[PDB]
């Protein structure tokens, strides 16, 4: 999975049935020293993920692998929100 | 799902069977701030789109998550058009 | 799906017997502007395309949807053979 | 799969049911000559691996491979600890 | 599939019983001119290929598509050794 920030929401009205009911987020990737990369994702929120928030992505068929996703054309999922990211320098991330 | 960009369309006749009654956009990538990436793709359009418009494509086996759309060798569809795109300073993108 | 262009043949007698009968192509991908990206794929061939041509590649899992290559390993499968390709200035490709 | 260096570990108490009791780790991918890359992967392991470790992290829905991970959304597994690298030159990496 | 050139082995012990009988090979990845690149991959070994051979590279679930390796945690799979690869200038290799 992938470290990535909240940007912001993405609204579409006329889609695919199998998307009614999804949240679409705008998720920006970070890199490993928490700096954000071009990369993103229209990822959808099963989390509840807010603006700035540091969050787990899930890429392709892993995005469909939650209770009622798995007919959805989802190819990015919010699967967690991060509250720590600790490495050998010590704490590169914590929300608090 | 990324956002993306409609530049035109791809007419292919000789083709696979499966392949047969879609139609192929080709739908150019956009960025977090909406501008023009390199990175494109052919993708089939279950929504009707049209030139210029901003659209969500989704990608690998999640393009292949519509009603008849299980056995066709699809890549990337077109899943949604977009009417906004809000970020933390406001709208990114708005149709109207 | 991808643009691309065909360069040559693969020829592997060593390997693996799921890829014995499936027509090996180089194609290079293509961009936007029909230019010559350093990204390629070598292709099994379903649809007969030849040095040259212009041709979808689809890539990943979509690469086996077609009636014999669900157990091969294919990752690319070139899916057609492009007439034109259609853009807002006009035709980026005609093959005539 | 690729070669990668545990950086450290990602703490999400906000996350999907399907993601708890899944240990996740910052894995900071490597090139051929045992060099950092920026590309990395917050991976989930089925191994044990520690900091500094060299590790194989398996991609796409390679990751979900495990036997009791077919349900969970992860997107990158490690799935081993590197003893040696061996190339022409020689040893590039040995654990010892 | 990728064309890529053999550049050595890689020895895991302590791995998912999964992986357990797969041949672990470092492969480097190739342009279309013949040129390694940088993206590599550890790839399992299915068709018995060695040091400096050229070889094609199946990724994703494409690697998992062989009789015993649907289980498997495979990303990349060694599926052929290349003799030959013939552009319009003429062969780009021949073993």
Do not use: H
């Amino acid at each position: 999975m992938q470290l990535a920030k909240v940007l912001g929401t993405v609204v579409s009205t006329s889609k695919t049935p199998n998307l009614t009911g999804v949240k679409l987020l705008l998720v920006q990737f970070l890199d490993t020293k928490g700096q954000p990369l071009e990369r993103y994702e229209v990822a959808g929120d099963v989390v509840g993920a807010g603006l700035n928030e540091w969050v787990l992505v899930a890429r392709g068929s892993a995005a469909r692998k939650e209770r009622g996703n798995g007919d959805r054309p989802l190819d990015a999922m919010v699967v967690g929100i991060i509250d720590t990211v600790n490495v050998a320098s010590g704490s590169l991330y914590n929300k608090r």
